[PDB]
Write a protein that binds this ligand. Structure first.
Ligand SMILES: Cc1cc(N)c2ccccc2[n+]1CCCCCCCCCC[n+]1c(C)cc(N)c2ccccc21
Ligand SMILES: Cc1cc(N)c2ccccc2[n+]1CCCCCCCCCC[n+]1c(C)cc(N)c2ccccc21
Ligand SMILES: Cc1cc(N)c2ccccc2[n+]1CCCCCCCCCC[n+]1c(C)cc(N)c2ccccc21
Length: 570
């Protein structure tokens, strides 16, 4: 017999609540910005402008009582806690000693990081991506990068999810030594320094919280009060659409690897592994963890770091300790968690780790069968070839021979096959190895006909420096160009060459190129034919499947060719 409560929507934060508390309007240290709570704090103001207020209120969700408290005037704030994500029909009743009066029902939101409060994501995929029916048991993986939402304008809803079994989210940094990040320039180091304020060394943080959970995406139905936004809310909604899709954070990468060189100290491993556990309990759409340590024993971005004696055993013990933690999470959640790793495959990288030992703890190894050659020097070669190319010298392929100075090769050439063979030779099972495809080229300038030793092979020439180009042509950094830019501005619709470029293919290597004779611009990449070769290769050997870097730089062609190659292998 009190007046029925009316809910004050705007005074109740629009009925948007959350188990995760996220700072939306600042950029600060990770522990300040991100706090996960077992119970969402709910706060609901309601009014009873006319008649009497009564003396007690009860809150209902879906007809079930979840809170009570005192009414003592014409305006009440109900605060209480609720543990479960989702959308519920809320009613609030006011009672006095003679009876109760319920508000009409209204939808309350409680966000959780599994995406339980979200609709399946609405997609906007380039239709050049085709439909396939590839055995769901074969891995088809790709990397999606956090920074691709800026100039590259490639957002979660753009991924051809149905053609993917695995999404690797690049990249998650680690607080601590990160000089390599500083040397890259731009805002990347400053952002990391900010994320790590008030955070212990060796713990993971979100690099760019604006990209991750702050930016409002209209295509996803984000609004001012949406408690989770950015790439991560879209990934949560993506899981709603494709529940068997694995989405896995990728920790480190080429530039963010400096902290791994201190994993020789188990205290630092303990810290890291703990932080990875809390990360996965905070961000529940994620299905495991991927370790991109580039690289045990060194020879990566960090010129002053790398220990060929101890890095490999640190890596193995890291994998065991991650697997122990993941087993805890599988026990507590009833879910399956995956442990994976992307690795260098030059002989000199592989030799510093006993992967037969490491892989017993692991689901997959992502074999980085790319970046074999590039604009970091002036020696052209195939950046992502399966086999040894025609430009290689005698004894260069297997490492038997001597270079153009008479100096012995130190080991087998950088090719996919040499890398996979070396891993198989250590005792890694083929069904745990994933072969990598390139959705980008690397290239040079100044490789003109007078530099060649074989007039029909630009891979026999000498360059002057790195390919240069504009972002409109897909060149986001010197020496590197998106596949989709190669296709638009060098190959042309027919794959025969435009704007001064010709196409060529090294059949021995299984690697294409596009070469401009007068500028001497040369670009090495993966195309439809080299990718069919790689799918046939993976199939012959019983490899787990294929993966790619990076999804934003494809137009549909590379991923299509990945599915076609895995069907068509003879
Ligand atoms: C793209 C996409 C776009 C949507 N509006 C969409 C809407 C609802 C559900 C899925 C959706 N997905 C698909 C979700 C991504 C999975 C990746 C497989 C890509 C299949 C794209 C489907 N496709 C479309 C729609 C239109 C075409 N003319 C075409 C022409 C040739 C081939 C395919 C083609
Ligand atoms: C537009 C905009 C709008 C806002 N309201 C805003 C608000 C706060 C902060 C930034 C904001 N921004 C934009 C600021 C973006 C920089 C902040 C995040 C730094 C993370 C660095 C990673 N990373 C980046 C970024 C770019 C790359 N090419 C790259 C290439 C290779 C490897 C890594 C790479
Ligand atoms: C591997 C590596 C990777 C880096 N990102 C890097 C960055 C800065 C300095 C050295 C670097 N090193 C190598 C450090 C020197 C020890 C090895 C002797 C010469 C090999 C240099 C190779 N190399 C260079 C120079 C630059 C690159 N961007 C590059 C990118 C991918 C793969 C290789 C690359």
């Amino acid at each position: 017999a009190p007046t029925a409560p009316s809910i004050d929507m705007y005074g109740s934060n629009n009925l948007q609540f959350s188990k995760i508390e996220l700072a939306m309007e600042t950029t600060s240290g990770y522990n300040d910005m991100v706090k996960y709570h077992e119970l969402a704090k709910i706060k609901v103001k309601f009014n009873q402008w006319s008649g009497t207020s009564g003396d007690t209120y009860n809150v209902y969700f879906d007809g079930v009582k979840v809170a009570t408290g005192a009414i003592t005037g014409s305006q009440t704030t109900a605060s209480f806690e609720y543990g479960q994500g989702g959308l519920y029909q809320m009613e609030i009743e006011a009672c006095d000693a003679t009876g109760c009066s319920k508000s009409a029902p209204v939808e309350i939101t409680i966000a959780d990081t599994d995406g339980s409060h979200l609709k399946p994501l609405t997609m906007n995929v380039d239709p050049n991506n085709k439909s396939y029916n590839t055995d769901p048991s074969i891995v088809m993986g790709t990397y999606f990068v956090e920074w691709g939402i800026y100039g590259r304008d490639y957002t979660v809803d753009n991924m051809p999810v149905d053609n993917l079994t695995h999404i690797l989210y690049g990249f998650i940094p680690i607080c601590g030594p990160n000089e390599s990040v500083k040397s890259v320039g731009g805002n990347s180091f400053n952002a990391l320094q900010t994320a790590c304020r008030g955070v212990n060394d060796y713990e993971v943080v979100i690099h760019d919280p604006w990209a991750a959970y702050q930016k409002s995406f209209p295509q996803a139905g984000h609004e001012y009060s949406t408690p989770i936004k950015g790439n991560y809310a879209m990934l949560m909604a993506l899981k709603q659409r494709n529940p068997d899709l694995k989405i896995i954070p990728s920790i480190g990468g080429g530039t963010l690897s400096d902290p791994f060189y201190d994993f020789v100290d188990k205290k630092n491993r303990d810290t890291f592994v703990a932080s990875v556990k809390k990360f996965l309990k905070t961000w529940k759409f994620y299905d495991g963890v991927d370790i991109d340590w580039e690289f045990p024993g060194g020879g990566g971005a960090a010129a002053d770091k790398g220990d060929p004696v101890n890095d490999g055993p640190a890596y193995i013990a890291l994998m065991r300790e991650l697997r122990v933690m993941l087993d805890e999470l599988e026990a507590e959640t009833g879910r399956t968690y995956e442990l994976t790793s992307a690795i260098g495959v030059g002989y000199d990288k592989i030799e510093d780790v006993d992967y037969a030992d490491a892989v017993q703890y692991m689901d997959y190894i992502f074999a980085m069968t790319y970046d074999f050659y590039g604009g970091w020097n002036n020696v052209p070669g195939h950046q992502t070839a399966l086999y040894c190319g025609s430009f290689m010298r005698p004894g260069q392929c297997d490492g038997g021979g001597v270079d153009e100075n008479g100096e012995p090769y130190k080991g087998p050439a950088y090719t996919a096959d040499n890398g996979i063979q070396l891993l198989l030779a250590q005792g890694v099972p083929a069904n745990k190895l994933v072969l990598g495809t390139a959705m980008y080229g690397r290239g040079w300038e100044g490789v003109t006909p007078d530099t060649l030793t074989d007039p029909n092979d630009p891979m026999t020439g000498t360059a002057t420096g790195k390919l240069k180009g504009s972002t409109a042509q897909g060149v986001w950094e010197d020496g590197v160009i998106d596949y989709k830019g190669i296709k638009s501005f060098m190959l042309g619709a027919n794959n025969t060459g435009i704007n001064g470029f010709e196409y060529g293919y090294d059949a021995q290597a299984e690697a294409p190129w596009v070469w401009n004779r007068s500028t001497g611009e040369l670009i090495t990449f993966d195309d439809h034919r080299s990718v069919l070769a790689k799918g046939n290769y993976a199939k012959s050997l019983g490899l787990a499947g294929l993966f790619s870097w990076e999804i934003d730089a494809d137009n549909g062609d590379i991923l299509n060719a990945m599915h076609e190659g895995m069907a068509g292998g003879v």
